[PDB]
Design a protein around this nucleic acid. Structure first.
Ligand SMILES: [Mg+2]
Ligand SMILES: [Mg+2]
Ligand SMILES: [Mg+2]
Ligand SMILES: [Mg+2]
Ligand SMILES: [Mg+2]
Ligand SMILES: [Mg+2]
Ligand SMILES: [Mg+2]
Ligand SMILES: [Mg+2]
Ligand SMILES: [Mg+2]
Ligand SMILES: [Mg+2]
Ligand SMILES: [Mg+2]
Ligand SMILES: [Mg+2]
Ligand SMILES: [Mg+2]
Ligand SMILES: [Mg+2]
Ligand SMILES: [Mg+2]
Ligand SMILES: [Mg+2]
Ligand SMILES: [Mg+2]
Ligand SMILES: [Mg+2]
Ligand SMILES: [Mg+2]
Ligand SMILES: [Mg+2]
Ligand SMILES: [Mg+2]
Ligand SMILES: [Mg+2]
Ligand SMILES: [Mg+2]
Ligand SMILES: [Mg+2]
Ligand SMILES: [Mg+2]
Ligand SMILES: [Mg+2]
Ligand SMILES: [Mg+2]
Ligand SMILES: [Mg+2]
Ligand SMILES: [Mg+2]
Ligand SMILES: [Mg+2]
Ligand SMILES: [Mg+2]
Ligand SMILES: [Mg+2]
Ligand SMILES: [Mg+2]
Ligand SMILES: [Mg+2]
Ligand SMILES: [Mg+2]
Ligand SMILES: [Mg+2]
Ligand SMILES: [Mg+2]
Ligand SMILES: [Mg+2]
Ligand SMILES: [Mg+2]
Ligand SMILES: [Mg+2]
Ligand SMILES: [Mg+2]
Ligand SMILES: [Mg+2]
Ligand SMILES: [Mg+2]
Ligand SMILES: [Mg+2]
Ligand SMILES: [Zn+2]
Lengths: 37, 141, 58, 209, 175
RNA sequence: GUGAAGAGGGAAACAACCCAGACCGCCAGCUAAGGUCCCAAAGUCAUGGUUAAGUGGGAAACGAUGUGGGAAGGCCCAGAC
RNA sequence: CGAUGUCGGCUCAUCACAUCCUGGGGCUGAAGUAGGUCCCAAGGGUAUGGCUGUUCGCCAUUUAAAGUGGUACGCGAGCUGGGUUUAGAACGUCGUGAGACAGUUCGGUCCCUAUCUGCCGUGGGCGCUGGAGAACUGAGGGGGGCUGCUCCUAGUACGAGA
RNA sequence: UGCUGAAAGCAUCUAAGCACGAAACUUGCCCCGAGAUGAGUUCUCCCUGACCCUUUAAGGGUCCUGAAGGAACGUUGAAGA
């Protein structure tokens, strides 16, 4: 669970989504990729 | 010398209005200018020319957008750690008279005659009252 | 003075920027004092005045 | 639930089979009697109003004696009111027996306090006093400083200072009842219930136990 | 969009009730109600409801695919049947059912004594294998997730409560 | 150039900012700067698009399938995804 | 500048949250235990001593914790006057001297009844539109919220053991 | 952290909707609490006389009327300047 104002994709399964005014970055099989804006 | 409508000669009315489906900002200024009393021709500033309104079922008044929850109600009391806060939906579920009374308290003027003009705001939030003996007229807005 | 003029205008069913424009079409020079003072008492003559403004526009 | 009204007379101790010295006190409770039953349609809320005790004939007043003879009861001394809940059947003429507490383990007791006069700042709110020596002049017991400088520049509301000490309604909860008395109309409750002896207290089943 | 233009099918043998929004479909499994929002026009061709935006809206295709997919799901729940089967993992982890109770010994000093909704018929063919049936898919997914997710299986041992068909991440405590 | 040696309407109040130079009287008309939903006077005036965030009504480096308009290209019933 | 008393202690606080404790969740190079690190969270609580005039600091010793800040670096019409600060005296050093020196030891007067705003208490008049004796409904307000450890589950799970 | 699921035929806690969530929030515990002028609710007890004068009636005065109930005075208190 990072908090950053410069989000990114890293692997081939990074899915940028937008939930409740927040640009989240998530992944299927990676706990470290999980993010928040 | 232009006419100054003395209070012992000027009359009062009785209207009712069911505010269901009406917005706050476009209802409250009309209920403010009615009891400010300017739609009558014989309006005078310094002497009250007010009316009587009765707003029925005031727990149905809606504001569009996301502001059934995002409308805050700040008030401070006087004891230093005692400023409180309740939101719009909680005020609606608790006491649906003060959602309209403070809305007209804003737009009505401020002073002794301001409280005098507030004294006629017989505003309820049910579907009955006890001034139908005064035979009111169903105004539409 | 403009207050009771606008009061009688909204009483009979017309605005103010149409009312003064119709009276300027009818080229009157009557001021706000006596235009209010007609609407104080004589309601049918001020009704005739806004009928004249509605007959100048319409 | 349906409270009762007692008068605290003294303090004593009940011993045990073992040797425990349980502190206890005796609130005399006569049989109270229903005086006015309300509900929503009559007044606005379901409750009960009662009175026990004894008052003289030439000092019960004509407003009160009419309310007395409207019921049919004696010349009691107080007028207390208890709120209620549903699931009950009640009348006015029936008097409440003293054995309503005969199956409840933990009770609550409310009453007045004692009157400790115009108190002090070291006495009521427990302000620790200052140096009684070591240079200090004429400030042994004062409450010191009370506000900041110039912003607010005023004494806040909610401050504590000298005043009247107690002498109001206070409440102790969840207490221990050990014994009732059908013979001489007593309640024995463990501890030190409020008020001086010679006062009348309002006892009830404990609100949360 | 494309599922908003590709419409539903519905076979017979069933008490169809499309009263506009309240489409109660009373058949073999049960019946579902939902008072849809009104951003869709729909009529029945006796085998196929048409789906499209009612004229005047802004985000008209929002409901046009979602209500179609939900109206697929409701009628196939009434027609055929629905469950998403779970599988308990772990020694000392046991589950017992009597109709509308779950008794789990999920590693706590108090056993998990949990209760069930109306549209749940559950059964344990083996002591650690439970399956809970129903027709309302949105309800029996969420109830299955709530009944499972007291303990996600920890990424080292795999010991916990998981789906019978999910993916867990085997981890590595390095030395 | 105001301001000191200058009054007045608009910037809530606010010497310096924009309008503007008041000798006295009037219950007279037109506008400037600025305002017209009610407080406090005047458009909930008409067509007409953006916005969905109280953004309007405080700000950077960078970020993103939020959104509207234009300009080209490649792949496609040799069904492109 | 026709004066707003200045550092630190004592006595009373209140808010802020960039949160010390305690509350709930995600990541780990997280097996458990204990931790790392950001994210939400400010209701409540926050050491007694030795030493110097001292906030700090060092040290001895607890606890769940010994938070960070503004408030005229809060508070002398509330209190010590030790520090820097008047008049005396001396040592170093400087000048020939008069005397100076964030260099140092020693002794050195801290004034005031509250008019008003404010705050905690106690009261009389009148209104509540016939007048008096009582008991109450409560829109609002105001105090209240802390945490240790031992024992059961269980020496279970986890773990090669520990 | 979820359930269902389009935008984007697939994954998507979100746009429609549905479920959980902590000492913070509203309550729940307790206190003074109708001078809440939006001045209340509420069961009770007392007064059922004659008149003339210009204030022509919500007005001024002479007489039997002076009850409900409170104040004052004395004895005082685990109430108190
Ligand atoms: Mg959320
Ligand atoms: Mg607070
Ligand atoms: Mg004003
Ligand atoms: Mg006393
Ligand atoms: Mg001390
Ligand atoms: Mg002295
Ligand atoms: Mg002394
Ligand atoms: Mg010049
Ligand atoms: Mg000069
Ligand atoms: Mg000027
Ligand atoms: Mg000016
Ligand atoms: Mg400004
Ligand atoms: Mg001004
Ligand atoms: Mg001039
Ligand atoms: Mg202009
Ligand atoms: Mg206006
Ligand atoms: Mg418009
Ligand atoms: Mg920016
Ligand atoms: Mg392909
Ligand atoms: Mg001076
Ligand atoms: Mg000075
Ligand atoms: Mg934070
Ligand atoms: Mg952590
Ligand atoms: Mg706090
Ligand atoms: Mg705190
Ligand atoms: Mg709380
Ligand atoms: Mg000490
Ligand atoms: Mg020492
Ligand atoms: Mg220290
Ligand atoms: Mg400071
Ligand atoms: Mg500072
Ligand atoms: Mg400080
Ligand atoms: Mg200071
Ligand atoms: Mg001072
Ligand atoms: Mg000091
Ligand atoms: Mg000294
Ligand atoms: Mg005095
Ligand atoms: Mg005084
Ligand atoms: Mg009084
Ligand atoms: Mg509160
Ligand atoms: Mg999908
Ligand atoms: Mg999904
Ligand atoms: Mg607690
Ligand atoms: Mg709680
Ligand atoms: Zn990843």
């Amino acid at each position: 669970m990072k908090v950053r104002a410069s989000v990114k994709k890293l692997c081939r399964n990074c899915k940028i989504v937008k939930r409740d005014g927040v640009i989240r970055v998530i992944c299927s099989a990676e706990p470290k990729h999980k993010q928040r804006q | 010398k232009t006419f100054t409508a003395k209070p012992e000669t000027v009359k009062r009315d009785w209207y009712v209005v069911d505010a269901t489906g009406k917005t706050l900002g476009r209802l409250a200024t009309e209920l403010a200018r009615r009891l400010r009393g300017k739609h009558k021709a014989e309006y005078t500033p310094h002497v009250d020319t007010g009316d009587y309104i009765i707003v029925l079922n005031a727990d149905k008044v809606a504001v569009t957008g996301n502001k059934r929850t995002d409308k805050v109600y700040y008030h401070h009391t006087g004891h230093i750690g005692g400023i409180k806060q309740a939101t719009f939906e909680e005020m609606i579920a608790r006491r649906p008279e003060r959602v309209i009374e403070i809305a007209v308290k804003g737009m009505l003027p401020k002073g002794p005659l301001g409280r005098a003009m507030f004294r006629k705001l017989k505003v309820y939030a049910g579907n009955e009252h006890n001034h139908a003996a005064q035979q009111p007229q169903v105004l539409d807005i | 003075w403009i207050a009771r003029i606008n009061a009688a205008a909204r009483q009979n069913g017309i605005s103010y920027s149409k009312f003064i424009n119709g009276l300027k079409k009818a080229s009157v020079e009557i001021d706000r004092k006596i235009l209010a003072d007609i609407a104080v008492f004589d309601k049918v003559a001020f009704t005739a005045l806004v009928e004249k403004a509605k007959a100048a526009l319409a | 639930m349906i409270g009762l009204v007692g008068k605290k007379v003294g303090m004593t101790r009940i011993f045990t089979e073992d040797g425990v010295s349980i502190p206890v006190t005796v609130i005399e409770v006569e049989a109270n009697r229903v005086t006015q039953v309300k509900d929503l349609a009559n007044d606005g809320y379901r409750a009960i109003q009662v009175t026990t005790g004894a008052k003289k004939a030439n000092r019960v007043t004509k407003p009160e004696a009419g309310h007395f003879a409207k019921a049919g009861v004696e010349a009691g001394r107080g007028l207390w009111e208890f709120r209620l809940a549903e699931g009950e059947e009640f009348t006015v003429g029936q008097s409440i027996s003293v054995e309503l507490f005969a199956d409840v383990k933990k009770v609550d007791v409310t009453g007045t306090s004692k009157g400790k006069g115009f108190a002090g700042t070291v006495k009521r709110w427990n302000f620790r006093t200052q140096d009684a020596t070591h240079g200090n002049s004429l400030s042994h017991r004062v409450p010191g400083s009370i506000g900041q400088n110039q912003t607010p520049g005023k004494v806040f509301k909610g401050k504590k200072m000298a005043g009247q000490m107690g002498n109001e309604r206070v409440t102790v909860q969840s207490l221990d009842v050990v014994r009732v008395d059908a013979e001489r109309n007593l309640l024995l409750v463990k501890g030190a219930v409020p008020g001086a002896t010679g006062s009348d207290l309002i006892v009830k089943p404990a609100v949360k136990a | 969009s494309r599922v908003a233009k590709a419409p539903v099918v519905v076979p017979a043998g069933v008490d169809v009730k499309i009263n506009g929004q309240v489409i109660t479909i009373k058949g073999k499994n049960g019946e579902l109600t939902r008072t849809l929002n009104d951003a869709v026009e729909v009529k029945h061709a006796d085998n196929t409801l048409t789906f499209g935006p009612r004229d005047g809206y802004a985000d008209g295709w929002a409901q046009a695919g979602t209500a179609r997919a939900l109206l697929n799901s409701m009628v196939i729940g009434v027609t055929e049947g629905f469950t998403k089967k779970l599988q308990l993992v772990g020694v000392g982890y046991r589950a017992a059912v009597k109709g509308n109770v779950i008794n789990l010994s999920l590693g706590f000093s108090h056993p998990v004594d949990h209760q069930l909704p109306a549209g749940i018929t559950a059964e344990c063919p083996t002591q650690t294998e439970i399956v809970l049936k129903g027709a309302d898919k949105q309800v029996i997914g969420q109830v299955a997730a709530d009944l499972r997710a007291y303990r996600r299986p920890e990424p080292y041992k795999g010991k916990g409560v998981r789906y019978a068909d999910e993916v867990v991440r085997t981890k590595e405590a390095k030395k």
